[PDB]
Design a protein around this ligand. Structure first.
Ligand SMILES: Cn1cnc2c(NC(=O)N3CCC[C@H](C(N)=O)C3)cccc21
Ligand SMILES: [Zn+2]
Length: 139
């Protein structure tokens, strides 16, 4: 679990969005596993606007932060799950690191701010949904 809170927006994994997220929907994209909903309170986070390929992510299944080298946002095949059919997930970045299904929503940060959130994993890999191209989150 986990979310990014920036301005009057809450960014979550689309497959973990609640009834309240859908009732206050701003934007969602099944191909990216992202959903953004509106909030009444001002958020605590700031978004990176950079091309960093190194950062640190929070892994809830280890209660620890780990440093990672991650690939550029790209179209990657993701096997079928209870949440989606077999498809290409876009804007996904992979890295070597530990992740379990419940780790989705953990934040990946670089020195400039929030880069993305955990969205996929398995096999000693961890995949992050990028949010750096969503410029409208800042206004
Ligand atoms: C070990 N392991 C297996 N599975 C994992 C997982 N879940 C995972 O990849 N998917 C299920 C939830 C939706 C994800 C999507 N974006 O399509 C795909 C996350 C993290 C570690 C995982
Ligand atoms: Zn950066």
């Amino acid at each position: 679990s986990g979310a990014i809170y920036v301005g009057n927006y809450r960014v979550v994994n689309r497959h973990l969005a609640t009834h309240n997220d859908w009732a206050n929907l701003v934007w969602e994209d099944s191909s990216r596993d992202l959903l953004v909903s509106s909030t009444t309170a001002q958020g605590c986070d700031t978004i990176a606007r950079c091309d960093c390929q190194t950062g640190v992510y929070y892994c809830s299944s280890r209660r620890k932060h780990y440093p990672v080298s991650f690939s550029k946002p790209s179209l990657i095949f993701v096997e079928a799950s209870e949440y989606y059919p077999a498809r290409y997930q876009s804007h996904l970045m992979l890295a070597v690191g530990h992740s379990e299904p419940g780790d989705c929503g953990g934040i990946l940060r670089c020195q400039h701010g929030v880069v993305g959130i955990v969205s996929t994993g398995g096999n000693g890999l961890v995949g992050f949904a990028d949010v750096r191209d969503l410029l409208w989150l800042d206004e």
